[PDB]
């Protein structure tokens, strides 16, 4: 596999349907040694889910806490000498932030919380993981949505946070490039997941994409997963600060619905 | 290999140093059956160069002629049933178009000729190759430069043509998506090639990139090659109408201060 022997940490595995699950499948297939994080009381769920992937570790990390992030790389640094990649696949905003009108529903705290978890957490992982990733063609890949680029209904504060994430990807790439670390993001098309079912009429947003995009379809977690895998390989060492759209071509059209 | 049994046409192989050479190396390693094009009197050069790649065909194609493009898919259609990918790696503008001041040097014919060969030729290959590429998760990949996005010294009409190419990539993706064909471009960082030595102080433009970009380096033809390969694989079926920068992260920075 093109990830043979590489040591990669995966965040945000929560379900059979999670994008992280797809990323894991791809990376396992390609021969990576994987470690997974989990939040609070999902310990048992995640341990069972990712068992099939032979993880070198399944450790607690709520990216709300600087302490846990620091402890993550302590515990991880015990079982691994160095680390080849980090996969950021974490997003949250309080539910009141995703209902209807952006200016109506937006709040100072919901804005803060969404950025803290969905954007800042990335540079945090980069901050603490940096020394384990020095000079070994290491890699970081964040997950983002086109809601960062264009104003959309319902996405609201999450869209603003995603924009924050993407700039952070860029500034993390400038910061970590001197250590040979590459930093990139995959902008996924909508996928039916646990985070996804946190918004109202998803089945049709998902059908709109299918109708209006060039390949007339939705992307699966393997399409996204396989792309993340590539971006953590020696093949992608010319690529950093980049956003690769995996959305069946949605990003490149306008009015494609005649 | 992730391109096992796939039938891919490669244009613009001219040298040991060509981007196409790197693309070939990558695709061969991944188990693709390859065919190559050549212009006029380079027959012997290209035949010898690409011998190592076991080509199913080495055929003449000057993209200036609609007839030759049509004949290419006739001859190719003889030795292959269908075709999985086309790799566009062709660019030209008259030398008078690349000296100094854009408005000084630009001409109606140089503008026409550059677009004809560097941009139109892509939609031409798509036009004629379309039937051989129907409903088999087929792929097109064009090579482009950041001169398309931003105004640069010397690049001039070639920059304008590259912008034309990138839009053509987008419109070809909308056109061919219904047939399951994906269309994408790789925006390569500067690389010391035969086309490249057609501009004056390349050694330093190449050194500026190395200094100012996040990974503090230049990309090699394998980094580009390996990315083109990926974009022609079943792993990239969620990706179309996209421009992936392979430029050591140059695209994402401003003011690498000196
Ligand atoms: N579903 C989509 O349409 C889609 C599209 C583009 C991008 N994405 C992005 O992909 C990522 C993965 O989401 P998903 O769609 O697989 O949904 P998911 O619900 O399966 O995963 C989201 C993850 O966020 C994690 N998370 C939330 N708060 C956390 C915290 N405080 N600390 C640590 N982890 C926390 C959860 O464990 C969960 O695994 C997200 O960044 C998301 O925005 C999703
Ligand atoms: N060298 C760089 O810095 C760089 C950076 C970004 C993008 N690119 C692009 O990559 C592609 C390949 O260029 P390269 O750098 O490998 O150099 P190269 O000189 O090896 O390749 C250019 C190719 O164009 C072909 N060509 C010229 N006129 C043609 C015609 N009329 N019909 C068919 N083919 C014709 C030549 O045979 C040649 O193989 C071009 O699209 C180029 O703009 C190069
Ligand atoms: C414009 O319409 C949409 C397209 C895709 C998605 C799915 N989607 C993508 N990233 C996400 C992050 C979160 C949620 C959903 C996420 C809930 C909290 C955290 C959501 C919307 C509103
Ligand atoms: C920042 O300035 C540059 C970076 C890269 C390149 C290399 N380069 C890329 N595509 C090309 C096409 C042609 C030439 C060269 C090409 C000559 C014939 C046609 C050129 C310039 C001016």
UniProtKB/TrEMBL annotation, chains A, B:
Chain sites annotated for binding substrate: 93
Signal peptide segment: none
Top-level taxon in the UniProt lineage: Bacteria
EC number: 1.3.1.9
GO MF term (any one): enoyl-[acyl-carrier-protein] reductase (NADH) activity
Catalytic activity: a 2,3-saturated acyl-[ACP] + NAD(+) = a (2E)-enoyl-[ACP] + NADH + H(+)
Record-listed NAD(+) binding positions: 12, 18-19, 62-63, 90-91, 143, 162, 191-195
InterPro entries: Enoyl-ACP_Rdtase_NADH, NAD(P)-bd_dom_sf, SDR_fam
Record pathway: Lipid metabolism; fatty acid biosynthesis
Family of the protein in this entry: Belongs to the short-chain dehydrogenases/reductases (SDR) family. FabI subfamily.
Protein name in the entry: Enoyl-[acyl-carrier-protein] reductase [NADH]
Organism for this UniProt entry: Francisella tularensis subsp. tularensis (strain SCHU S4 / Schu 4)
Encoding gene (name): fabI
